[PDB]
Structure 1
Amino acid sequence: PAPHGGILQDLIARDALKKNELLSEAQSSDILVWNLTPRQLCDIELILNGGFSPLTGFLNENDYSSVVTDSRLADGTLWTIPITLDVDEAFANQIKPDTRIALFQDDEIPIAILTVQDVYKPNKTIEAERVFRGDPEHPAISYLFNVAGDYYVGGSLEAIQLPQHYDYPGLRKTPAQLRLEFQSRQWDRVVAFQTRNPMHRAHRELTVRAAREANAKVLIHPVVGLTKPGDIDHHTRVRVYQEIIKRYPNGIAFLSLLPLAMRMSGDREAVWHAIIRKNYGASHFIVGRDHAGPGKNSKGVDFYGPYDAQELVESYKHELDIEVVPFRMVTYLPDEDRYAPIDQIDTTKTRTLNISGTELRRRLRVGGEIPEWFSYPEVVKILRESNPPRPKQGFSIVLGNSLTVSREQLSIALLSTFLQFGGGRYYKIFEHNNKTELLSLIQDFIGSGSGLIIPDQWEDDKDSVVGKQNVYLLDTSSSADIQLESADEPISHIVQKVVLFLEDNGFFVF
């Protein structure tokens, strides 16, 4: 269909003949420079390549206010997520309307020149409530208060280049490029599938069925910009998508990566997704159950209703100009060796099988079997490599402050003891001396599968520097992961406590 607003705002194309000129200006000594943050880089790529058509810059207060309260740009164009350039006061103060500033990536690569229209301090309390529903635990609200700048700079953009990416050069198609890929294949009906997770057998099945019903080709369009905290890394996911696209009938599907920064904003995000896929050339779009939903908060309540997304999108159906295809999740029928829509089974007493996210996680943690009816083996293999089981995981044992036994001797005893076991894990007594440059390497060694023996705790104000995954405290305190009977417990007894704790937790298998 036609881009949202009618014209694809591909600014790279629009400004092609101004590239040298804009680059020189961006590099002039007198121009103010703002280094884009990771989320701003995702957003600016989508504005610059027309993925956010009709947007041609970051929203000034006029459009922003209208999006916050009315889900529309000031001119009435449907638009549910505010895209703004958030900066701190020190920068906002040296800015005024008409000022032209250079926007860089990594303080080295000029990306665009922004012509300032306005500078404002938005009420982040109202934004959180009106756009993200108010729950302080909502990923977007957490970001909005703890990470985002307090000042928004509205303005028009002129393109120099899209944010630099060295991985997957072939798969990161812009809207113009994707439309040409579809055109060269004579594809005029394409149904897009959104995802920020690995794809299992059920997803392959549901997308092929969607294609069959809409008489459309398939576009697997995963998000590789920012997704939900804790999600599988995009490199692992892309490997999974590259593997699964090979399981579709030849010529039915195309894989392209979307550098979007999701807000995990449920229904409003679903509408935003529909618009973006339309800009990218899709004729149809699948809106999932709890689409773009961040789950439940700490008290167990849903941030969004499971069908809020499908209902909001349905309310705007007459002006979206992209067909939404009903979501028919499928499940496996052992006795029939096939998959069927969950809305069509049971009631007649029919056996079904499924593996939840929690169960999948468990199996990967213990190195357990994962059935081919659930996920293609080549996909499972990829997931195991990126998320190895306990016998292959790294860890750290921290000698707590309470210890009065020799820390040097206890560290040496632990190292010598661990070196007896087979397995191939690399071990090291690691002294950080409370230095950030050393503390930040702890998770790097753990991520490499190594076992670190840390002779002393770091100061509390350094905690934030060390991730807590697989880090265990050996101490007398009740908070200790491995509790000592006493501060001067004999070294040989301490060693045994540690070895048995590690075995009980799967790090050692005998």
Structure 2
Amino acid sequence: PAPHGGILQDLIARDALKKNELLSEAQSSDILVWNLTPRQLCDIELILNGGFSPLTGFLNENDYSSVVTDSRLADGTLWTIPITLDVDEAFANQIKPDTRIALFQDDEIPIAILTVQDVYKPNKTIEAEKVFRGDPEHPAISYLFNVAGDYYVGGSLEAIQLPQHYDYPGLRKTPAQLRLEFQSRQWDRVVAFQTRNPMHRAHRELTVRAAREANAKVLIHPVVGLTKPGDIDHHTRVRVYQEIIKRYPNGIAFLSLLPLAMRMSGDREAVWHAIIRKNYGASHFIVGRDHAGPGKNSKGVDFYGPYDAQELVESYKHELDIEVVPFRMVTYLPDEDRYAPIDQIDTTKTRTLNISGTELRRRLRVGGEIPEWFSYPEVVKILRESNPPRPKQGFSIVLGNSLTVSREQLSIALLSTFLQFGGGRYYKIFEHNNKTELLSLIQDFIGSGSGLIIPNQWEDDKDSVVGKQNVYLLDTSSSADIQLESADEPISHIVQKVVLFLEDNGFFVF
């Protein structure tokens, strides 16, 4: 179909003969400069290549406002997710309309020149409530208040180059490129599948049913920009994707990475995804159970209904101009050894089985087996590889402040004890001396699979610097992970408590 708005806004192509000129300007000693944030680098790349057609810059207050209260741009164009350039009060104060800002990446690569139209201070509460449904735990809302700048700068863009990427160099197809790919193959019907997790049997089966139902070729269009905090990294996922694609019949599917920054905005996001995919050249778009949803909040309540996205997309049907292929929960059928949409089976006279993400996360962490029927073995291998079971995980033991025994001696005792177990983990007594340059390394080591023995706590003001994962506190405090009987407890006693704690949590296996 035609790109949203009718015109593919590939500004890289549009501004080709301006490149050298824009470049010089971007590099002048007088232009105002803003180094894009991660999500901003994600958004700007989708703007500059026509992925966000009709957009051609970041939303001004007029367009922004309409998107928030209307799910439409000011001119009425269907558009549900606001794409804005969020800056701080400091930077904002130097901006005036007509001003031109050079937007850099990594403070080194000139990306584009923004021509300021306005500078407004959005009401984050409204955006939170109206666009993301107001639950404070919602990924988009937390980002909105905890990461996003408080001032939005609207304005038109002029492309210099798309953000730089040194990984998966040829796989990040642009709308024009993809469109050219489908064309060289004479693909006039393509059903796109969005995804931010690894693909298992259910997915392969669901995408193939789609391909069969729609009579169209398959485009595995995974998101490699920004997803949900805690998701599997995209590298591991690309591997999973490249492997699973080999399970489809020869010549039926194409893999292209989308550098989109998700919002986990359930239904609104689905509408947005469809618009994006249309721009990229797709004729059909899959929308399954809880599309783009962030699951449930800590209270166990749903951020979105399992089919809210499908319903919203359906209501915008005659406007989207891209065919939606909706799916009901695709589950496993033991007795027939096959998958199928839940709406096609009698959940009464047929048994179903389902390993949820939580359940999978758990198996991977315990080294548990994952059913041959659940996912393909190569996929699971890749997953285990970057999401190792406890006996391969790193950790850190912190000698609480309440501790009254010799910290030096207790440290050594823990070190020498861990050492005898053997098994391949690296251990170290890590003294941070409250130096954040050190505190920031604690997780790098845990991430490397190492066991760190930390002689003492760090200032509360520095706590943010440290990644709490696999970081256990040894103290008499009720809120200690490994609680001591008393601050003066004999070392050997403490050592056993710690060993048994770590062994009870899978770090040690004898």
Which range, TM-score by smaller chain? over 0.9
User: Which has the larger displacement, 294-303 or 119-128?
Assistant: 294-303
Q: Deviations over 1:430-475 (max 9, x none)?
A: 1111100111111111111111111111111111111111111111
User: Which has the larger displacement, 153-162 or 328-337?
Assistant: 328-337
Distance 1:442 1:348 in 2: 52
User: Which has the larger displacement, 416-425 or 133-142?
Assistant: 133-142
* Partner SS, residue 169 of structure 1: coil
Distance 1:359 1:70 in 2: 39
* Structure 1 contact 219–254 (Cα < 8 Å) conserved: yes
User: Which has the larger displacement, 398-407 or 351-360?
Assistant: 351-360
* Partner SS, residue 340 of structure 1: strand
* Partner SS, residue 24 of structure 1: helix
Distance 1:2 1:503 in 2: 59
How many aligned residue pairs are there? 510
- Runs of 5+ unmatched residues, structure 2: none
* Structure 2 contact 26–102 (Cα < 8 Å) conserved: yes
Distance 1:341 1:296 in 2: 22
How far did 1:131 drift? 1.1
Distance 1:150 1:463 in 2: 25
Distance 1:402 1:71 in 2: 55
Do the aligned partners of residues 269 and 348 (structure 1) sit closer, same or farther apart at CA in structure 2, a change above 3 Å counting?
Answer: closer
Q: Deviations over 1:350-372 (max 9, x none)?
A: 23322111221221111111111
Distance 2:439 2:231 in 1: 24
How far did 1:338 drift? 2.2
How far did 1:334 drift? 2.4
How far did 1:348 drift? 5.3
Do the aligned partners of residues 45 and 251 (structure 1) sit closer, same or farther apart at CA in structure 2, a change above 3 Å counting?
Answer: same
Q: Deviations over 1:276-335 (max 9, x none)?
A: 000000000011222111122232222212221111111111111100012144322222
Distance 1:267 1:340 in 2: 23
How far did 1:163 drift? 0.6
* Partner SS, residue 118 of structure 2: strand
Q: Deviations over 1:230-260 (max 9, x none)?
A: 1111111111001101100000000101111
* Structure 1 contact 206–328 (Cα < 8 Å) conserved: no
Distance 1:99 1:26 in 2: 13
Q: Percent identity?
A: 100
1:361-510, aligned counterparts within 5 Å? 361-510=361-510
* Partner SS, residue 112 of structure 2: strand
* Structure 1 contact 201–373 (Cα < 8 Å) conserved: yes
Distance 1:474 1:279 in 2: 55
* Structure 1 contact 475–487 (Cα < 8 Å) conserved: yes
* Partner SS, residue 336 of structure 1: coil
User: Which has the larger displacement, 126-135 or 241-250?
Assistant: 126-135
How far did 1:347 drift? 4.6
* Structure 1 contact 206–329 (Cα < 8 Å) conserved: no
User: Which has the larger displacement, 86-95 or 211-220?
Assistant: 86-95
Q: Deviations over 1:84-107 (max 9, x none)?
A: 111111111111111111000011
Distance 1:438 1:248 in 2: 47
* Structure 1 contact 287–324 (Cα < 8 Å) conserved: yes
Distance 2:249 2:68 in 1: 43
Do the aligned partners of residues 74 and 465 (structure 1) sit closer, same or farther apart at CA in structure 2, a change above 3 Å counting?
Answer: same
Distance 1:448 1:192 in 2: 36
* Structure 1 contact 191–283 (Cα < 8 Å) conserved: yes
Distance 2:443 2:269 in 1: 33
Do the aligned partners of residues 213 and 267 (structure 1) sit closer, same or farther apart at CA in structure 2, a change above 3 Å counting?
Answer: same
Distance 1:3 1:144 in 2: 29
Do the aligned partners of residues 347 and 124 (structure 1) sit closer, same or farther apart at CA in structure 2, a change above 3 Å counting?
Answer: closer
* Structure 1 contact 196–231 (Cα < 8 Å) conserved: yes
Q: Deviations over 1:14-71 (max 9, x none)?
A: 0111111100000000100011111111000000000000001111111111111111
Please tell me the root mean square deviation across aligned C-alpha atoms, in Å. Answer: 1.1
Please, what TM-score do these two structures have when normalized by structure 1?
A: 0.98
* Structure 2 contact 327–341 (Cα < 8 Å) conserved: no
* Partner SS, residue 251 of structure 2: coil
User: Which has the larger displacement, 432-441 or 297-306?
Assistant: 297-306
1:71-150, aligned counterparts within 5 Å? 71-150=71-150
Q: Deviations over 1:96-144 (max 9, x none)?
A: 1111110000111100001111111122221112111122222111111
* Structure 1 contact 192–284 (Cα < 8 Å) conserved: yes
How far did 1:418 drift? 0.9
* Partner SS, residue 296 of structure 2: coil
* Structure 1 contact 43–83 (Cα < 8 Å) conserved: yes
Distance 1:70 1:335 in 2: 48
- Runs of 5+ unmatched residues, structure 1: none
User: Which has the larger displacement, 491-500 or 199-208?
Assistant: 491-500
How far did 1:402 drift? 1.1
